[PDB]
């Protein structure tokens, strides 16, 4: 698909058996999702941006379906105001910027 | 151009006659640049990120080149951790997400 940027590029994702809305975010290195259960070991991480940093839990080898495209990668879980699909998963669905 | 996301989508911009590096950020509604001098009056704005908020100065109708593409629009100035080109200007240069 081609997604314009007149509004926030929000898409439906499936993760851990749950449906969520998430923002395709080329400015994000990492993918960060609101609190939810995920399988496996985790380690703590701090991620920062405007406003400062939040503490998240890092889970690896998590499968996500993004707008119908399956990908696997690291997913951070924590108190993010918005669910964010970052570059680590955008690459896996073949997402590019074009102009 | 077509820009992949294996690395940060950093580009050269020109603003106030000077070249700077900036990130093409589809997760950002607005464009925010590090402290610099811009002409005219400014208005207050707050922008929200993953860790909270910052106050910024809003300047309108600012001339700015992004990857050599000419734009004129709203530029926010403040303590952003990186120069960010957001959707307000990405739309002006005809930028889309594709996969
Ligand atoms: O503030 C943030 C933010 O926290 N991040 C960083 C981030 C967020 C999530 C994961 C990750 O690895 C990094 C940025 C990333 N793009 C816009 C995310 N923003 C929003 C933003 C920024 C500038 C101007 C705006 O109008 C909006
Ligand atoms: C502490 C470093 O902060 C960041 O990576 C960042 C901040 C604002 C926007 C974006 N896209 C990234
Ligand atoms: C308080 C509202 O916060 C946001 O709009 C936001 C947070 C993190 C990443 C991005 N891209 C946006
Ligand atoms: Cl990953
Ligand atoms: Cl590729
Ligand atoms: Cl604008």
């Amino acid at each position: 698909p081609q997604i314009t940027l007149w509004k926030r590029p929000l898409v439906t994702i499936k993760i851990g058996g749950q449906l969520k809305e998430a923002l395709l975010d080329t400015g994000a290195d990492d993918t960060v999702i609101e609190e939810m259960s995920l399988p496996g070991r985790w380690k703590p991480k701090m991620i920062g941006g405007i406003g400062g940093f939040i503490k998240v839990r890092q889970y690896d080898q998590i499968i996500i379906e993004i707008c119908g495209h399956k990908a696997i990668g690291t997913v951070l879980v924590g108190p993010t105001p918005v669910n964010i699909i970052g570059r680590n998963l955008l690459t896996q669905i073949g997402c590019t910027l074009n102009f």
Side-chain angles (χ1 to χ4, degrees), chain A residues 1-40 42-99:
Chain A
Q2 169 168 105
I3 300 171
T4 56
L5 297 171
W6 303 113
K7 61 182 185 173
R8 286 197 174 201
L10 293 171
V11 298
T12 298
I13 65 167
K14 189 175 178 173
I15 179 175
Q18 298 182 38
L19 292 177
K20 293 188 173 298
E21 187 181 51
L23 180 63
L24 305 181
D25 190 338
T26 61
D29 297 336
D30 300 326
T31 291
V32 191
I33 306 294
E34 65 199 336
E35 286 291 346
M36 65 171 295
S37 179
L38 288 180
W42 59 268
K43 58 186 160 182
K45 187 174 187 179
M46 294 294 308
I47 56 179
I50 286 177
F53 289 74
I54 61 167
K55 188 181 178 189
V56 297
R57 299 190 302 283
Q58 179 184 328
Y59 294 86
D60 298 327
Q61 296 175 356
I62 302 296
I63 295 177
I64 301 197
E65 193 155 6
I66 303 159
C67 200
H69 296 247
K70 300 184 181 66
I72 187 169
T74 294
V75 174
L76 310 179
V77 176
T80 181
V82 174
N83 297 323
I84 294 304
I85 305 307
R87 293 186 299 102
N88 73 304
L89 294 180
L90 294 172
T91 57
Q92 300 298 286
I93 69 173
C95 185
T96 60
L97 289 160
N98 299 86
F99 58 100

